[PDB]
Design a protein around this ligand. Sequence first.
Ligand code: ZN
Ligand code: ZN
Ligand code: ZN
Ligand code: ZN
Ligand code: ZN
Lengths: 383, 112, 306, 371, 196, 21
Amino acid sequence: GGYAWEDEIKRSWDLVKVMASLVASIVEARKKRTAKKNITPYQRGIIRSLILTLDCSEAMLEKDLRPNRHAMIIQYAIDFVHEFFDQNPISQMGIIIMRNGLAQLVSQVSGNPQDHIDALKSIRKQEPKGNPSLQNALEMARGLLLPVPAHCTREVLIVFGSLSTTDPGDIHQTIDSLVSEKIRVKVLGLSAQVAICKELCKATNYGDESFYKILLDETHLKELFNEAVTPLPVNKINKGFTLVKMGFPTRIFEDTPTFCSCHSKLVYGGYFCPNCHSKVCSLPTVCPCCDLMLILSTHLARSYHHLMPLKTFAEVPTTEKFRSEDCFSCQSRFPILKNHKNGKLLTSSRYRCEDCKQEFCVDCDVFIHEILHNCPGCESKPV
Amino acid sequence: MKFYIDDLPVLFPYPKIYPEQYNYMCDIKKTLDVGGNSILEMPSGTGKTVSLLSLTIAYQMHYPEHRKIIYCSRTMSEIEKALVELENLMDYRTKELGYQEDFRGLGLTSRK
Amino acid sequence: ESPSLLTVIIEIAPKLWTTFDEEGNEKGSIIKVLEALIVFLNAHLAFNSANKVAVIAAYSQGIKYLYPESTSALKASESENKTRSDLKIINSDMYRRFRNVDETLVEEIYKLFELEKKQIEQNSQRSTLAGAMSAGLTYVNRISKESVSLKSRLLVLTCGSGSSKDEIFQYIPIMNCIFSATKMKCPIDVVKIGGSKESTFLQQTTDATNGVYLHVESTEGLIQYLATAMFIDPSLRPIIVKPNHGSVDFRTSCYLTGRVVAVGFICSVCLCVLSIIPPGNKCPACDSQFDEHVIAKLKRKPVVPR
Amino acid sequence: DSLSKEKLLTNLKLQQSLLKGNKVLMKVFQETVINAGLPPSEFWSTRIPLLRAFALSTSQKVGPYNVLSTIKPVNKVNVNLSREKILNIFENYPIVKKAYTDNVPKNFKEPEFWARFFSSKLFRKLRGEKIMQNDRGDVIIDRYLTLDQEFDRKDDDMLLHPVKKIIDLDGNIQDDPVVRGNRPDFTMQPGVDINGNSDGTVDILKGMNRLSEKMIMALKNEYNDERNELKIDDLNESYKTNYAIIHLKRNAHEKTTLKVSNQQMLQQLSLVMDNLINKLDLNQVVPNNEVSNKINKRVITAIKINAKQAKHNLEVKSTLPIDLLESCRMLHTTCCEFLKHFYIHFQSGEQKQASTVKKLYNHLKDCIEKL
Amino acid sequence: MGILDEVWKHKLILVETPDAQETSLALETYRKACSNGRGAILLSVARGKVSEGIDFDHQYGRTVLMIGIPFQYTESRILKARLEFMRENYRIRENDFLSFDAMRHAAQCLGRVLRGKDDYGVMVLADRRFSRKRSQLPKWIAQGLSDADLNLSTDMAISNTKQFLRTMAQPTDPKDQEGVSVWSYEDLIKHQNSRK
Amino acid sequence: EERENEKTLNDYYAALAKKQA
Ligand SMILES: [Zn+2]
Ligand SMILES: [Zn+2]
Ligand SMILES: [Zn+2]
Ligand SMILES: [Zn+2]
Ligand SMILES: [Zn+2]
C-alpha cells in the first residue's frame, strides 16, 4: 500500500534469463512447405482484363505504412504493373482510383505498361482525400469490362484500406450484376475484414472466401502483390471455350521512318500485321486496322509455364543413401551439415524430383520453382 | 451427422460438431436420465439452441416414455430463432430418416 | 573492370558430330572445336584475373559437368584431379591457371567419352541440350548469389549437321531459359556448326536475350569466329554492335500441322497455336470442347456486294 | 439502361460535350466525318468505351451523408458553401429545398436565404441541436417549422413496415399483454423537466434516427432467409474448389514446310580418343591467313549491316516542313480510320451491311486518289 | 461538444428509442448499414429491449463498447427491499447482489456478439470498477481475459484491438482447427473411443 | 482558332438536326 517509487528497482539486468539449432529452423521450413505439398494443373484465366481499384482517401493518409499508405501503394502498384506485364503480357489493363466520392478512371484499359506507369506516377503527386465509395468503382469496372470479349477474363482488384463505404445506391445490386456478368473480384483490404468485401469476394468468386486478403506487415503486402500476379483458376461451370483469331507480325527493318498505324508518328521499327500489312509500335497490341491481336512467340511463351506447373521437389530422407555428393543443376557440394557426433545427420539438403529421381540443393529448388519452369533432371532423362 | 450417445441416436444437422457441444450433450443426457434440476452455461458462439433441440428430439423419439418437451425462452425473437433452428433440424431428420415423422411443434405468444 | 562468368554449353552427340564428319571432308572435327574451345577459355581467363569458367556437355544419355570437376575429388585413388592420374594430354609448361582447368576438362572429356562408348548400344531419341543450359543458368545464379557483383554469359556449342531437324520438345524449355537469362541479364551466344543454316528457336534465344547467333559450316578456323564475335563481355555489351545478320521472325509452328504459322487461331484454354480450325470442334492439346457459335464466327465469310 | 451501346451511339449531347472537351478527337472528327463524309455512327462505333468513360465521369454521384454535420462556423464567423454541399442539403433535407423553391425566386436572393436558414432554429433542429427559446431564429424559415413536423410525420408513416420476428422488439414488449409489474424509474425513462414535460433530447434522437433511416432507404432505388440467417456456417463443411483441371498432351506434329550405324561411331570415337591421347597442338587453331580474311569479311559485312540498321531506331525529327508533315500525318490518320471502318464492316460478315462495305471501299479508293 | 459530428463521418449513428417500433426500425437500419459496409454504431440500454434477445453476430457486432457498469438505481426503494430480503433470508450481501446483477446484465450484453467459432469480436469494458470483477465473470469469458488487460487506458487498448482485427482477418489454418476446436464424425468417434 | 471550328461544328449539327427531323 505505497507509491510506485517506494517499492523496488526494476531489476532489468536480471530480466534476461539464460547442436539442435538446425532443426529449430528446418522443422519450421517443413511446416512452411507442408502447405505447398499439394499441386495439380489448374486451368487458369490466361487472357486477362484486370481493373486495379485504388483507394485515394483520408484513410490513405494514415501513418501505419511508410511514409503514408498512399506512396507505398502507388509504388507497389507501379511494381505490380511492371511484374504483371512481365508475366502476363497479352492482358489488357485499366487503372482507376477512388477519390472524393467518385471513381476516377485514370487510364483506359490497354496493353501498354508505360502509359499505366505514367498514370500511376501522375497520381503519385496528388494528395489522397475524400470518402471512398465501392459501388462507384464496381460500376465503373462493370462499364469498362463490358467491351471485354468472352475469352478474356473479367477481373477486378481493389486495394480498400478504408473500413466504411458510402455508396449512392444499393451495392448488392451491383454485386448481383457483377456475378451475372461473370466478373471475378479479389479485394486487398489494408485494415480489417470488411463484410461487404467478404461477401463480394465470396459471391463473385463462386463461394470462395479465400480471395479477401489482409496484410500483416510490410513484406506480406508485396507477397499479396506477387501472388496476385498469378492467373486465377477458372471454375468448372465456366464455358468460354472459344478460339481466338490473332496473327504474328514480323519486325520490319527500315532506315526510313514511317507512320505507324496506331500513333501516326514516325517510328523506324515496327511490326507489319500479317492480316493487313500495318505497322505498330509495341507488342502485344491489337492491330488498329483490322482489330487483330498482334503478338510475338515470347508473349504466349511467358504464359506456357502456368499451364505446366512444376511439381514440388521432395527433399530426400536423411536416413536413405544419397545419390551423389554434389547437386545436379549447379553441382554445389551438398553440405555434410552434421549437427554433432551424437546429433547425427539431419536436414539433408538434396531435393529429389519425382519424375526424374534427380537431387537438387535448396538454391536449385528455389531457382527452378519460380525463375526456371523446367526440371533439368526431367530433361537429361532420354525419353 | 448421426452418432450415438449411450443408446441414443442423435441426428445432428451439421457435418461437424464442437467438442464442447458433445460434452454438453453428455451432461444433458446424464441429467435427463437421472432427473432433477441442473444449471449449465453453454458459451455463446457455439451452437446452443440447435444442440438442445437435437438432444430433446432424439430423447423423445427414441425413449419409450415419449415425454413431451417444454422450452421456455424470454422473447419471441429467441422463440422464432428456436423455431427456425427446429425447422432446419426437422428437415435434416426427415432427409436422413427418409420420412416426415409424427411431430408437432409451435411457438406461443400473445394475440397482438 | 567487373569480372564475368563464362558458362559454356557443349552439344556432344555421336550421331550429329559423325554426320558432320561424313558431310565434311575431314574426320575428327570435334578435336578441332575442342582445342578451339580450350584456347577460348584461356583467352577468357586472360581477359580478367577474377572471371570464372563453366563448361557443360549434353551427351546422349544425359548431361555431365566438365569444368569445374565434381566434388567427389577427395585426394584419394578416386580423386581424378591435379597430379592424381595426371595423364599428359597438354604440355606441363602451360600457365598453371590455364593448365589446371584445361587438363581437368580434357580428362573429363575422355571420361565422358569412355562412359558414352560404354553405352553406345542405346540410341537416345531425346536431346538433353535444353536441360543443359537450364542447369547452366542454375549454376550462373549459384555463382551470382555466392559471389557479391559479377556478370555472366552463355556460349552454346551446338551442331545440327543436317541430320537433326528443329524438334518440338525443344520449344518450352528453351524459352524458359530465355526468360531466366532475361531475368539475370545473361546474354546467350549460340554458334551452330552444320549444314542446317537456320535454327529458329536458338535464333530467338540469341535475339531475345541480347546475344549473338552465328551459324557456321566448317570446323576449321572457328576460333576466329569465337574470339572475334563470341568474346563480347557483359561489361561492354551495349557499346559493341552485334554480327547477328540473321533476322528471326519470332514466329512459331502450328500444332496439328507443324508448318510456320501466319494469321490464325489459338485455343483460349490450352493456348497452343493452330493454323486452321481443328477437326471435331475440340482441342488437340487439352481436348477443350469448343462453342459452335464462335467458330462459326471465325468460319464466317467476309462480305462484298454482288 | 443508358449504358447500352445503342444509347451511347444515339447520345448526341454527350458527343457534343466530348468534342468540346477533347481536342485531338475533335480534329479527327473534323477531318474525317465533316470533310470526307464518313457517317458519324461509323465513327462512334469504334469509340464506345471512350464515350462510356466520358458519360460515366459525370453520371456518377456521391453517396448520401450527413451534410449538415460537416457544416460548422469556421466576432465574425464564416462558413464556406460549395454547390455540392447545397445539392446534398437539398436531397438529404427536402424541407430546405421546399423553402428554397418558394423563397429564393420570389422575395430574396440565395445568399440571404442561406444566411437566414443558418440563423434559424430549423437548421438547429435538422443538425440535431436541442431547440432553445432564447434564440431569435429567423421568422421566414420558422414559418416552415410546422411543415417540417408534417414531413417528419409523413416520413415516420412511410418508413414504418412490419419487421421480421427475429428483431420484433414491439413484439418483445407485447409478449405478455397483461404484464404489469413495478414501473421503471426515471433512469429507465426519458428525461423530463420540472413540470413533467420532456426536455426534447428524445426529439433530437428521433430526428437523427430518422435521418439514418432515410439515408439507408435512399439506397433502395433503381440505381426462408431466416433459415440462412440462423444457420451456423462454421459447423457446415468448408468450401470445396470446383476449379477445372486439364491434361496437356505433347504429341504435336514435327515442323514441315542420313542414317548412320554404330560401327563407324565406334571407330570415330576411337580416333577422337587416341587423337586426344597423343597430342593436341593448341596452335593449330590459327588460320592459314586466307580463311581468316574471308571469315573476317563475312563478320565485317554482318557488322556493317547491323550497324546501318541499328544506327537509327517521342517521334523522330523529319526533313519535311511541319505543314507538309502535319498534312501527311493527318492523311495517314484518315487512311487508318477508313481502313479501320472498312475492315470492321468487311470482317463482320453481314450481307445487310454490304452497302456500307461498298461505301467504305469507294471512300478508300477516293483516299487512294487523295494519296 | 461535436464528438457525434466526427462519428457521423465514419459510421451511421443509431440510438435505442422507447418506441419499440422505432427501435426495431433502427435495429434493421443498423443491420442494413452493417451489411452493405456503410458502418454503423448502435447506442442501447444495457438493461433494455435490444440487450435481450437480439444478437449481433458477425458483422453486426465487431466491437462491444461497454461504457460503465450497468448498475441499477440504488436509491430506488424497491432495490433496497430486494437487497434486504436477500440478506435476511438467503444471506446474500447487498453489494454482492448489486454487482452480480449489474455484471450479469453486462454479460448478457456481451454474449450477443458471437455466433459460431468463426465469429470474432472484442468485448471492451470502459469503467474503472470492472478491474476487480474478473472472478465473477463467465468462465469462458474469464479464460479469454488476460492479466495484462485488467487495467488499460484508451491507446494501448486501441492498439490491441487493431492487432486483433488484423489477426482474425487472416485465413486460419484448417490443420490448426481440424480436431481441437471442431470435430467431424471421425474425430467424435475417436474421442468416444478414447473416453471408453 | 477553334472558335470558327466549333461554330462550323454547331452549324453542321444544326443541319443534321434539320435533316433528321
Ligand atoms: Zn504508334
Ligand atoms: Zn491488321
Ligand atoms: Zn544445386
Ligand atoms: Zn525432374
Ligand atoms: Zn486447348
